[PDB]
Amino acid sequence: MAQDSVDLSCDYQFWMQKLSVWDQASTLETQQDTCLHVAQFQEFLRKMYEALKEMDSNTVIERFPTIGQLLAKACWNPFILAYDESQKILIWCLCCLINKEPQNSGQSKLNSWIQGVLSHILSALRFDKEVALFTQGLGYAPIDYYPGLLKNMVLSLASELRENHLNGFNTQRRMAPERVASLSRVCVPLITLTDVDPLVEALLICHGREPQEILQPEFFEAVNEAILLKKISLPMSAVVCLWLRHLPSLEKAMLHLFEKLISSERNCLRRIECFIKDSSLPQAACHPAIFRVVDEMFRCALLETDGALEIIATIQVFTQCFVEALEKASKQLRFALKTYFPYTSPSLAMVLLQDPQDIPRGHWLQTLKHISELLREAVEDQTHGSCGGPFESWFLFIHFGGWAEMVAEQLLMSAAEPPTALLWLLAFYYGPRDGRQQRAQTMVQVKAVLGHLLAMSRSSSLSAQDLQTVAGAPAQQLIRHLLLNFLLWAPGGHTIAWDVITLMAHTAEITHEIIGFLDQTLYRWNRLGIESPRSEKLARELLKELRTQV
């Protein structure tokens, strides 16, 4: 109710004298500029169409003056018509313009001019004449063969490019890289049109022997868009080579993953596994270099937010998908794991790989015992010929969920003299760069808290205040999520749950943290086939109600 023309009326002249730039784009540079400026102009058209549809035509003159020239430019510009709904919005626009009963002959002229451009778009051979007259004589219409026609056109070229790829230093026709670059710009406007997929596949695969790129990355990223938006449905080898030759696509897609775990679907891990397996990210990650990239990205993410739980959850989902994609399709000659994990020794990794589901529930204690032993041998006796230091082995340890989370729940099950192994381990988890002075401090802290909570579980379902009393920091999140483990695990819970929860419910940040923790633990149980349905339904109801509070 404020501007009513000007945010639109300025961009009117902008796009207007930009059509004068492009004008059917029979060049390279008109084409390139048009390609980047298409969709913005499309939204401009949406606003314009709204502004027209709401009102009548043939009475107002707001920007009606140059409109015919504007639309004629757009129409004769075919890349306009190649983008998704641009054409259709042009239709609706022109429909807004028509007059039922032209009264002054200018209205009739307008309408006839409209019909003319319409037929120009719809019933016009913009094409060879021989094949036109051939079918005219055969008694056909454009329609009834344009699809298969198009298809044949595509297929010829698709084969051709395979030939060119196979010709790895032959004497034969080295196909024009100019035509290739022409196609690179021709595909993208109509990338969504279904008859094109094999061409694009072939463009991305038939790499050839240039030392320098010959496609424009506008194409690479306009492709990346429709991949990650799932409008294209390509094979896997195509998108891997795309990721593997154009880096900003990879970067921008890994970003698009974070967009979900932060923006929309905080702590619904099944959406996250769904997204990972929807894309071929673990499959692509089977390739080493891509794995190292995404590792570096998550490492930066991890050192900005010093221990973001949602991010760590995402890591472990991705690691699982990657491990299975690796075990699937790498029978002969798979990469030695210190490829993907060089800084660490391989021995520790070799242990970490083992699934919990392989082993009975009892020996997981012994597993974690040897693990924490080895982490101590690593980081405490931090000698050269190993990891650089603590952070690196800690980051290694992140990726293997279950082996990370089982310490608390096992320690709840082994508070009968909880062994120093698990204490040091979880201390190392919740704290890197601590020093043994800090680790021994937190050790006895949590062990005294265990002396409390053991007897507290042996007692009846006591209050939430005997719990909040032992709270009063360097050990707040540790002790917090430890208590959360204790709650569901101990059957004394399920009564004082909301009490403890509303007590610790200071903020929404801690709320989201714990929500992620809970979705994590439920996800873990369902995957492991390890459940107490009490705690399942309990945590379910709680997480559900807290998804209303946020």
Binding site: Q212, C241, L247, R292, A308, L333, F335
Partner: protein
């Protein structure tokens, strides 16, 4: 007239074959491993990497940009992109069994120091390899990623309540 030989066409058979293997798409990576398996099996177990690196580094001319401008390139950049990347990936893994002297100059190339329109991949890869050598921290903003990437990463790392984990030791 509009034909060229292979730029590798003049070389030791094993290594030339290896290049012709790495040429072959993504999978060429693992084919690299298969080659070395086959050759440690074959009568010539000693594969002189030292020999190979020299030929990678060695310069030769090209006439690119306009029609009227010479420049030099080593083998390593004139050969096709996919072989470069596959090769780099293999090198990461065989890094134990390589000589530093040649590796370093290779990495000086890998930097593509003052290469307008550079190879982002190769740059990141050289960075990472130098890091794996324990010498590529560089005391720089030594991110294989772009500062663009790190920027829009921090832009959303801001939108999460950090943990109290002491990761930096300020």
């Amino acid at each position: 007239e509009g034909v060229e030989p292979a730029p590798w066409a003049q070389l030791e058979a094993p290594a030339r074959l290896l290049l012709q293997a790495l040429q072959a798409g993504p999978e060429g990576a693992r084919r690299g491993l298969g080659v070395l398996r086959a050759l440690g099996s074959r009568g010539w177990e000693p594969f002189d990497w030292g020999r190979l690196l020299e030929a990678l580094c060695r310069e030769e001319p090209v006439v690119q940009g306009p029609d009227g401008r010479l420049e030099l390139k080593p083998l390593l950049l004139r050969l096709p992109r996919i072989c470069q990347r596959n090769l780099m990936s293999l090198l990461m893994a065989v890094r134990p069994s390589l000589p530093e002297s040649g590796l370093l100059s290779v990495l000086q190339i890998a930097q593509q120091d003052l290469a307008p329109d550079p190879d982002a991949w190769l740059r990141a890869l050289g960075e990472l390899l130098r890091r794996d050598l324990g010498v590529g921290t560089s005391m720089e903003g030594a991110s294989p990623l772009s500062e663009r990437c790190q920027r829009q990463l921090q832009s959303l790392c801001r939108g999460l309540g950090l943990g109290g984990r002491r990761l930096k030791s300020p």
